[PDB]
Amino acid sequence: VLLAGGPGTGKTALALAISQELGTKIPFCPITGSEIYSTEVKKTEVLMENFRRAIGLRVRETKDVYEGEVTEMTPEEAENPLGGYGKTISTLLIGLKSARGQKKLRLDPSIYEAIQKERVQVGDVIYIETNTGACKRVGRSDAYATEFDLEAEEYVPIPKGEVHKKKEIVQDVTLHDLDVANARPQGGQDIISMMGQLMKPKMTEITDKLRMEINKVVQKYINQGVAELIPGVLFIDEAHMLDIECFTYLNKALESPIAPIVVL
Amino acid sequence: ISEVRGNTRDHRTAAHTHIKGLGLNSSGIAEKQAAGFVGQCAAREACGVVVDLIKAHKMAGRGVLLAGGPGTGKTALALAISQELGTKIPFCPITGSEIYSTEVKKTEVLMENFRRAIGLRVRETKDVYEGEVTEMTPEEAENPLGGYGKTISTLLIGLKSARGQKKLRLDPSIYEAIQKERVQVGDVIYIETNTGACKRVGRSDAYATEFDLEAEEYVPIPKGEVHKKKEIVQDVTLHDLDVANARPQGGQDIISMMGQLMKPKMTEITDKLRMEINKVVQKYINQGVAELIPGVLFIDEAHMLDIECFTYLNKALESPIAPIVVLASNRGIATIRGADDLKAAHGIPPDFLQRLLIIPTHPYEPDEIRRIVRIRAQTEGVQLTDAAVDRVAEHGVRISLRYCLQLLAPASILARVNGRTQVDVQDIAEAEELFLDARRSANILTSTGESGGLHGFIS
Amino acid sequence: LIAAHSHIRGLGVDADTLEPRPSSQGLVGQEKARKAAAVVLEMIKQGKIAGRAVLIAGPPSTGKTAIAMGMAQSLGQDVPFTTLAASEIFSLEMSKTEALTQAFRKSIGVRIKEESEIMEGEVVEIQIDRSVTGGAKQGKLTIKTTDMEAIYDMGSKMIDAMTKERVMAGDIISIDKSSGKITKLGRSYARSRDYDAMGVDTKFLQCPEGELQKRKEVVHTVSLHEIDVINSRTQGFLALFSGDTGEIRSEIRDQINTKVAEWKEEGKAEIVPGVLFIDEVHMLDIECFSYINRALESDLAPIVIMASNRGVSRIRGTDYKSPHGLPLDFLDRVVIINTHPYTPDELRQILSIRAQEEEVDLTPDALALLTKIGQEAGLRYASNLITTSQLIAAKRRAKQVGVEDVQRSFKLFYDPARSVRFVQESEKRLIGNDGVVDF
Amino acid sequence: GLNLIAAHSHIRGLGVDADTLEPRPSSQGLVGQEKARKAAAVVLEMIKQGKIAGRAVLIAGPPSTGKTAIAMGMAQSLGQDVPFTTLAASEIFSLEMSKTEALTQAFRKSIGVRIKEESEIMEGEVVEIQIDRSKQGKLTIKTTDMEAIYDMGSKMIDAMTKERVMAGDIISIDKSSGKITKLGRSYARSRDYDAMGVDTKFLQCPEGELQKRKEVVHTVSLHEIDVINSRTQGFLALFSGDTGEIRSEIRDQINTKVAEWKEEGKAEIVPGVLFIDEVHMLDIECFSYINRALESDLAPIVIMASNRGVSRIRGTDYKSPHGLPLDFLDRVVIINTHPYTPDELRQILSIRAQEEEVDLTPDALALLTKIGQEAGLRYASNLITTSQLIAAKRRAKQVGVEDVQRSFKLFYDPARSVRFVQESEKRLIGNDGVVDF
Amino acid sequence: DTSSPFFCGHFAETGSFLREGTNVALGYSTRSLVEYRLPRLIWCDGGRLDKPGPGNLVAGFRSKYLNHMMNIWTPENIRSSLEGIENFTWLRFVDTSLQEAYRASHTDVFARAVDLASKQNRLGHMQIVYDEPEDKKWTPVHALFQICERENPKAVAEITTEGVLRDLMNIARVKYRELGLCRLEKAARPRASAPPIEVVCDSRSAVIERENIMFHPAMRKALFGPTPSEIKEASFGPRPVTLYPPRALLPAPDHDKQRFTNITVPS
Amino acid sequence: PDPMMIRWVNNKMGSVVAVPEELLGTHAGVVFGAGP
Numbered sequence A: 001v002l003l004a005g006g007p008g009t010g011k012t013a014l015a016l017a018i019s020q021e022l023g024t025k026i027p028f029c030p031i032t033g034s035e036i037y038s039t040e041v042k043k044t045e046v047l048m049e050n051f052r053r054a055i056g057l058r059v060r061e062t063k064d065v066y067e068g069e070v071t072e073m074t075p076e077e078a079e080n081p082l083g084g085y086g087k088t089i090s091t092l093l094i095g096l097k098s099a100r101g102q103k104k105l106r107l108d109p110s111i112y113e114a115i116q117k118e119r120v121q122v123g124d125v126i127y128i129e130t131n132t133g134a135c136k137r138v139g140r141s142d143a144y145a146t147e148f149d150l151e152a153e154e155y156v157p158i159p160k161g162e163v164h165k166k167k168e169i170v171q172d173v174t175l176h177d178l179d180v181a182n183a184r185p186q187g188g189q190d191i192i193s194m195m196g197q198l199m200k201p202k203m204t205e206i207t208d209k210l211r212m213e214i215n216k217v218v219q220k221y222i223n224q225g226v227a228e229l230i231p232g233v234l235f236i237d238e239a240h241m242l243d244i245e246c247f248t249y250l251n252k253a254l255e256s257p258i259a260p261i262v263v264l
Numbered sequence B: 001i002s003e004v005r006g007n008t009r010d011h012r013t014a015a016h017t018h019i020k021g022l023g024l025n026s027s028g029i030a031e032k033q034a035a036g037f038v039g040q041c042a043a044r045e046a047c048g049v050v051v052d053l054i055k056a057h058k059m060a061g062r063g064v065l066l067a068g069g070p071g072t073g074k075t076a077l078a079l080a081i082s083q084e085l086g087t088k089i090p091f092c093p094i095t096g097s098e099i100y101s102t103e104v105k106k107t108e109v110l111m112e113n114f115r116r117a118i119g120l121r122v123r124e125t126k127d128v129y130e131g132e133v134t135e136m137t138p139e140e141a142e143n144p145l146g147g148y149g150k151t152i153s154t155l156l157i158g159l160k161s162a163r164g165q166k167k168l169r170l171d172p173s174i175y176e177a178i179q180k181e182r183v184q185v186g187d188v189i190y191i192e193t194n195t196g197a198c199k200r201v202g203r204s205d206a207y208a209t210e211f212d213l214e215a216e217e218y219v220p221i222p223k224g225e226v227h228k229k230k231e232i233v234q235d236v237t238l239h240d241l242d243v244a245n246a247r248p249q250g251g252q253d254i255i256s257m258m259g260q261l262m263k264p265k266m267t268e269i270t271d272k273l274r275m276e277i278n279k280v281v282q283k284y285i286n287q288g289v290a291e292l293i294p295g296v297l298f299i300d301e302a303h304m305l306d307i308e309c310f311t312y313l314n315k316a317l318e319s320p321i322a323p324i325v326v327l328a329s330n331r332g333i334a335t336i337r338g339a340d341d342l343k344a345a346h347g348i349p350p351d352f353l354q355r356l357l358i359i360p361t362h363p364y365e366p367d368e369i370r371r372i373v374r375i376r377a378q379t380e381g382v383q384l385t386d387a388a389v390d391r392v393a394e395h396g397v398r399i400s401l402r403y404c405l406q407l408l409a410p411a412s413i414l415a416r417v418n419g420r421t422q423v424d425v426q427d428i429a430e431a432e433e434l435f436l437d438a439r440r441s442a443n444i445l446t447s448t449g450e451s452g453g454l455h456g457f458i459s
Numbered sequence C: 001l002i003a004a005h006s007h008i009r010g011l012g013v014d015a016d017t018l019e020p021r022p023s024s025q026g027l028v029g030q031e032k033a034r035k036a037a038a039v040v041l042e043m044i045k046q047g048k049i050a051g052r053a054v055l056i057a058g059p060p061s062t063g064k065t066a067i068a069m070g071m072a073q074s075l076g077q078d079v080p081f082t083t084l085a086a087s088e089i090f091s092l093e094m095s096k097t098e099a100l101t102q103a104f105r106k107s108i109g110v111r112i113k114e115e116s117e118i119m120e121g122e123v124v125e126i127q128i129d130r131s132v133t134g135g136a137k138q139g140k141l142t143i144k145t146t147d148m149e150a151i152y153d154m155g156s157k158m159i160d161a162m163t164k165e166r167v168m169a170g171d172i173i174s175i176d177k178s179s180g181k182i183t184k185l186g187r188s189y190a191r192s193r194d195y196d197a198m199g200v201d202t203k204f205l206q207c208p209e210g211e212l213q214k215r216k217e218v219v220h221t222v223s224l225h226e227i228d229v230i231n232s233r234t235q236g237f238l239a240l241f242s243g244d245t246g247e248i249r250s251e252i253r254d255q256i257n258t259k260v261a262e263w264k265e266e267g268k269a270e271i272v273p274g275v276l277f278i279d280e281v282h283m284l285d286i287e288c289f290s291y292i293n294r295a296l297e298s299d300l301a302p303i304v305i306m307a308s309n310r311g312v313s314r315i316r317g318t319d320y321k322s323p324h325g326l327p328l329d330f331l332d333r334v335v336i337i338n339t340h341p342y343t344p345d346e347l348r349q350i351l352s353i354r355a356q357e358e359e360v361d362l363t364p365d366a367l368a369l370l371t372k373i374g375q376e377a378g379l380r381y382a383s384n385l386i387t388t389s390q391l392i393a394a395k396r397r398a399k400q401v402g403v404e405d406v407q408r409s410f411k412l413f414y415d416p417a418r419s420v421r422f423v424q425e426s427e428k429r430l431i432g433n434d435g436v437v438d439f
Numbered sequence D: 001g002l003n004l005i006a007a008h009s010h011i012r013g014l015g016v017d018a019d020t021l022e023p024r025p026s027s028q029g030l031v032g033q034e035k036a037r038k039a040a041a042v043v044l045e046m047i048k049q050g051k052i053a054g055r056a057v058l059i060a061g062p063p064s065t066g067k068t069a070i071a072m073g074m075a076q077s078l079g080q081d082v083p084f085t086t087l088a089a090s091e092i093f094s095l096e097m098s099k100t101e102a103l104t105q106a107f108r109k110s111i112g113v114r115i116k117e118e119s120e121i122m123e124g125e126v127v128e129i130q131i132d133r134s135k136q137g138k139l140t141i142k143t144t145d146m147e148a149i150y151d152m153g154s155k156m157i158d159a160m161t162k163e164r165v166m167a168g169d170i171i172s173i174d175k176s177s178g179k180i181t182k183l184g185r186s187y188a189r190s191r192d193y194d195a196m197g198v199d200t201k202f203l204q205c206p207e208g209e210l211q212k213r214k215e216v217v218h219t220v221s222l223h224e225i226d227v228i229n230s231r232t233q234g235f236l237a238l239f240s241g242d243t244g245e246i247r248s249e250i251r252d253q254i255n256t257k258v259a260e261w262k263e264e265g266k267a268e269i270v271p272g273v274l275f276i277d278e279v280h281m282l283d284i285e286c287f288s289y290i291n292r293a294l295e296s297d298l299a300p301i302v303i304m305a306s307n308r309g310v311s312r313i314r315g316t317d318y319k320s321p322h323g324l325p326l327d328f329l330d331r332v333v334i335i336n337t338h339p340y341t342p343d344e345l346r347q348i349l350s351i352r353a354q355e356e357e358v359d360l361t362p363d364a365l366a367l368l369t370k371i372g373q374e375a376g377l378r379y380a381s382n383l384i385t386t387s388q389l390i391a392a393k394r395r396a397k398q399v400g401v402e403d404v405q406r407s408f409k410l411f412y413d414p415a416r417s418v419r420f421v422q423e424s425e426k427r428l429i430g431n432d433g434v435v436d437f
Numbered sequence E: 001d002t003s004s005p006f007f008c009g010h011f012a013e014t015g016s017f018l019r020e021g022t023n024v025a026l027g028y029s030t031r032s033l034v035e036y037r038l039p040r041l042i043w044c045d046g047g048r049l050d051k052p053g054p055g056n057l058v059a060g061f062r063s064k065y066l067n068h069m070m071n072i073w074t075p076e077n078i079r080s081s082l083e084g085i086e087n088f089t090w091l092r093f094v095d096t097s098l099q100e101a102y103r104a105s106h107t108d109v110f111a112r113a114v115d116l117a118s119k120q121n122r123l124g125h126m127q128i129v130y131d132e133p134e135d136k137k138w139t140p141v142h143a144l145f146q147i148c149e150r151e152n153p154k155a156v157a158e159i160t161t162e163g164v165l166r167d168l169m170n171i172a173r174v175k176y177r178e179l180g181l182c183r184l185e186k187a188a189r190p191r192a193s194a195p196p197i198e199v200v201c202d203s204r205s206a207v208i209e210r211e212n213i214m215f216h217p218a219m220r221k222a223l224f225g226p227t228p229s230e231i232k233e234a235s236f237g238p239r240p241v242t243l244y245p246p247r248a249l250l251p252a253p254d255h256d257k258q259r260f261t262n263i264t265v266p267s
Numbered sequence F: 001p002d003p004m005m006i007r008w009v010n011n012k013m014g015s016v017v018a019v020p021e022e023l024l025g026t027h028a029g030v031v032f033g034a035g036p
């Protein structure tokens, strides 16, 4: 959809009219023609990243939290022969104590390292997220409350309910978010997904194979009756600033079976 | 270990060796044949005014141009200013073809060279206990804490320098130093005053033979004091503060022990950091601790800076903290490198040229080239007869200035090979055909080198 | 020190009528552009109207950057004022458009307010328990004012700050409970005569009265670029100082805009809109203007004020000319304020202000000769003659500068009007676009 | 064994008299270029003196005349003492460091720092590790002649533990620093194990005294000191190449400390020779830095070569002699060369024959002289190998007129290739169109 | 109302609440829905050019004769080239040894950083102690060429009475702390997280290689710290002993309220 | 009675360091004058 006409005649007033006529829950990506000339990636990568910013997805998720107050924290190391690194903690016995029914659970080494990079002492309420493995300390429980304190901790009460909760949420995720998530991993408790969030983030070239495999994963979500696909608009203002290497690639970007509508 | 050679400690002859300063009066009027220069009166008077502007601390972002043709003395006046100001005032002689980098934008290397050109002098004190440990003897407290074992109230250390030893009573929380650093009897340490945590330098040299093989560094006894209360003047350029605030040197983790382990990359510096450092340096000056000393950024070959650099130079010179910018241009009507549109004077844009105090530089008279030849000959030590001086002056007037200062080294080599000590007319008349100038080279190139064939050049 | 814009102390207009005074607060000798800049300053201080463009066009050496610094001194250290030059954008790390986007988002301050909890009082005892060869630490701090006697606990960071500060018994320290800094204010006892490596006897302060846990409401102003950098990276903070920010994706900015709107509605933060000054905008190419015209379309754009020097110039990155070097689809958006060249009865008082700022005393004959030179070589040569004549009068030991000092400085240092003739006379011993000869 | 007969293999030094500087014609490989070789001898005699800092010597002349031959003659006739640096100009245009810094590093390599010292090292084969768990210990080491027992106190027992030294290793201890450097194992214990590991390399036993002290003369360059002081473990960067724009403050500190070492008598500065081959490939953005780097005290005597006539300067659009800007040609001195007479061509082909151990009949040498006069040196020197090989195919000892005429018939000189191109223009892709018959 | 970013991977859902009563064991079941299916010929047997199995007969020879025999960093091949104009002339003067260079030219950037983590600096302390005009700026001859290690203004700055230069060398941290960029709530977060892509290869060697590369317990030990059993056997012994993680080499997170995660707690 | 924690306490009179009895036989008592 091309919007011709001279300057000062309201080409982008129509674009804001469209973006306020579609609604909030439909994706709308406005860019320019000078924005895609980057220094990290080729400009066709920036074009495809905008094309997959302009496609949205509404997904239901079932998070499995363990929301407790840590009672007994005791490591249980395993056998460690002569291999240079020495001992390694392999098993724990962390006891979570909610308001109605406590639990005394056993952990992997990786979920112990997730605990250990959060500095969880005895008394800290946490909720172990058993989707990644992450576990955010919330604060000292109010049974250890004392006004003569200096650490400026946030005292919260004991979490009511069962210690093994299960809650469903709705999330609005675009396909480019899934591309970035599977490209540079930042979830889990291994080393690639931990040393990959200490480096500086760089825009990289998400190839064709990831953009097809994530399409098959989203189709698997849709066939389970969970996710809903909502395509959107890519509004390329000042399209004459794009050179011929971009109008060549827009042909193959529009020949895809899933591609948002372009407004130039 | 390293064997010392007892040879002659001479120096090397550069092109600006004979320059030793401007050579002015006590009133500013220049005087010919003084401190290396020959003639060039108005340029040396103007450069003396520039030197007075720099040492008077009234310069806060001026700019001085040195015009004039090639081989007339612009870099000579620059090195004369740098030797007239001294050593304790900074001087950063970059070129025009030294801002082009491949890690940062080229309007950033200019600002880093501005920060290299500014110095900061800080006067402070240093209070340290020093020397080799003789005893580490504790002392039991008067009232031991119930429930524990040893209760130690004052820890005694006997520190022995190379002049005198001294017993020292200390607070017992030096123990966390001594266990962590592994300090024993016979290890030189220093104890500071603001915190008081000793750090071992090494095993002393007197205990270098109690064992046989167990070796480390064997540092000697500190040949000095045992209680230093010594004051320190310390010169730090603002480039060093920008680097040490942007990229920290020593950290304790993995990724800063990879940052110093991988190559250091020049990164562009955000302007909030420079604004904060200027705002805090101007506060420590007002407290009366640190002195700001501006210097010279002699940007040689100022016609290599393109039009994208002078635009940034206008901003950088309008800053309240900036050194002087002594440019050096030797072009007439030239095309500016960035915008190939306007033919401007000196390669400098007409907007930027109004800021500049333009100092001229004139060609040399045909009776001053021989004085430059005499000074250059008595600088190298090459002595020569007067007819040889007149022949070198003939070659200097008829061909070039830089060429008559280069017929002195092969003439001296052929002189002390032929069997003499001084250079005559025959040695220069023989060395003038082994080392041709540009003019006879172009004559051979055009006349004999007619066109591209078999025995011809490649045009 | 004394830079080229240190005499200026604001813009110098009225507060009720904003009429241009002929001589007020440094900016002396122009009336139209200062009144228009007063109107621009008033609609910046209103903060309501978003996304404009002001183009201060005119001949060089006419005070355009002087009017910009006059607006800069008139806002104070509250509203952001980015002094961007047009050549800083051409980076090699990041793209040319993202540098513009950062340059816009550096000029929208967010002013937040938060409560910290400060302590006050005399330290009675420190109690530190340490492990052997790595491990945790334990801490008990007994502190006393004139009223309360508290025994607080400590964590690892508090002990790491105590040992860094060396807080002994009998110190007046004040601990921020939230941020966790320790500032010793002095002592109440004297220095002990039992230990050697103690330190320096500090200021003698008495025991503070009142209470221990006092509250404080501090105000912190961060630009939107700092929020973008601290929310774009998981661990890689401090890259908003060392410029190591590669690229910030649009998913981060389109969330931070919504969260700043929510902070505006919640009463947490206040958006202070600022000024983006672009000095000599004629260096940007058309790929920059095709983004600057569309970044001035949202509620989070700063009021751009920018300068220019050029006549009918060709736009970089193109093949054609235009007035001021700016494209005619971008000159519709802007509003152009002209500046005029000066008159000698105004150059006289401008040189008088520049002479009184650099602490130089003059004679009226020397000032008349200096005005005669400034008619023909501009202010940029005359101010340099002022400083040079001051130091030449200092060399020959004279109280005030004279006609002879100005003639000496005019003889030594050429104005550009004579350097052009010096180029055009000796054309054979200067490298043109061709060869050169040597005598 | 990685040393094969190249074009520059018969040139064993410059070949002039060292007393009166008289270039005798046939000496040390070079033949009959008397004035250029005399001028190169004067340059070499002011290089070894080392006082006069930062000249520049251009070697002009036609191609195939001997401009790199005289450079390799000056390189061979210095020895390993004074440095030399063969840098063609296209090496500078890099993509990791700029042109200015990658040309500064060409100046920083050609200045050596020379320092003489005493290395107090100890070789030895371990016999029995004796640790007294009481701290003390005893180490028994042997060579092919001696055997000794040395005491140990506390911590090098822990160094042995961290190094995992077994009985049979070859250890070396630098007693001035004190660190165990395990060199491997001995051949006397290859009979012991059967399935060896990866890291173990076998060595002979050490020979002679245990305590070896020797006065050794180290010679590094300033570029070594610049790259080692770049980053923390930065010594492997000068082998790898993982370095970039080194800051100027590090090089300033290093030049200050080298001046301080020269004052205190520790170090001797030996200036060397930078050789910028084919200097016409540099653009004006490089000559504007060469014109400043030839000013300092620490600048090598630069010798540069060139081929081109009145040509354009790269980076700009105006012609100039030798492809160099004239503000740079006002600074250098120029040694012109000349083409060769046939009397010199015959004996240059004779030297190229006796280098490649190829025997030639005199009629073949006269024919090859005529071919070299009609086509050049680089084609005549490429017919000795081909005629030898064609004589080897038909099993003849001496090459003849027939083999040289066969080699001239098969391979084309560049004089006839131009007539071959201009004879058939419709099939070679000129600029637009091809017929393809 | 708590929250978290969307999760793209495939975890293991718990069946019921009334079955696993008290003593349960959490399992790290996080896998990527994006898979990559390789056979056992390429990923295990002879498709990798590094695994020295049969069929890949080159990878043992090439490993040994490029890392240990024909290597210019092995100590035998350095000891012959250390005596003059030759290439390892400078190795005597840098503060290293043959074993130091041989360990530095074979490990990673990571393990070399762990080896740097247990080296006590002393050439900065030389400028504190040996600072006399009579002492003529003494440096050890086995550390002579480390010039920039020796003359450093930071080492002198960390000793002075007034901290007028220690308030300039790390003013970035003070300005970053005084603006409240650590107590400020994190406004933005990524909209999806994911574990790294793994290979679905159905041999035991693939699972061994995955749990030795993707987890690799030496780096986890060198990153998080020592076991408390190791701290007990290192702090109750009769003699001081060293630790391979000498301290926890995890960097301090620069955001106090939300460190290394993306989980959000309401407030 | 802590197993491995060494106490420092600084009051108005002086400042003393208490060491547990269980660490005197270890290497941590070499500074404090106990040793192995």
Ligand SMILES: Nc1ncnc2c1ncn2[C@@H]1O[C@H](COP(=O)(O)OP(=O)(O)O)[C@@H](O)[C@H]1O
Pocket (backbone or CB within 6 Å): A006, A007, A008, A009, A010, A011, A012, A013, A014
């Ligand atoms: N139909 C319209 N009604 C109201 N305002 C309009 C209309 N058309 C254009 N405008 C005004 O014109 C101005 C610029 O329009 P814009 O779309 O930016 O021009 P262009 O088409 O050149 O991008 C806007 O501020 C808008 O208010």
Ligand SMILES: Nc1ncnc2c1ncn2[C@@H]1O[C@H](COP(=O)(O)OP(=O)(O)O)[C@@H](O)[C@H]1O
Pocket (backbone or CB within 6 Å): B015, B016, B036, B037, B038, B039, B040, B068, B069, B070, B071, B072, B073, B074, B075, B076, B330, B372, B401, B402, B405
């Ligand atoms: N006034 C002078 N007295 C003595 N020698 C001079 C003088 N001016 C120039 N020279 C000599 O001329 C040579 C070339 O001048 P140079 O400084 O290269 O010119 P430019 O500054 O144009 O590059 C230098 O070696 C210098 O020694």
Ligand SMILES: Nc1ncnc2c1ncn2[C@@H]1O[C@H](COP(=O)(O)OP(=O)(O)O)[C@@H](O)[C@H]1O
Pocket (backbone or CB within 6 Å): C004, C005, C026, C027, C028, C029, C030, C059, C060, C061, C062, C063, C064, C065, C066, C067, C350, C379, C380
């Ligand atoms: N109206 C004015 N009031 C005060 N100072 C002025 C005025 N006009 C010019 N100046 C002085 O002249 C100098 C040049 O002004 P500037 O704005 O830098 O010129 P340009 O706009 O060409 O860059 C400034 O340093 C300023 O101090």
Ligand SMILES: Nc1ncnc2c1ncn2[C@@H]1O[C@H](COP(=O)(O)OP(=O)(O)O)[C@@H](O)[C@H]1O
Pocket (backbone or CB within 6 Å): D007, D008, D009, D029, D030, D031, D032, D033, D062, D063, D064, D065, D066, D067, D068, D069, D070, D348, D351, D377
């Ligand atoms: N005087 C000489 N004596 C012997 N061989 C020579 C002589 N001059 C040149 N050569 C040989 O001629 C060849 C061409 O010389 P070279 O310097 O490479 O030419 P160019 O200057 O065109 O590069 C070289 O391989 C060299 O071996």
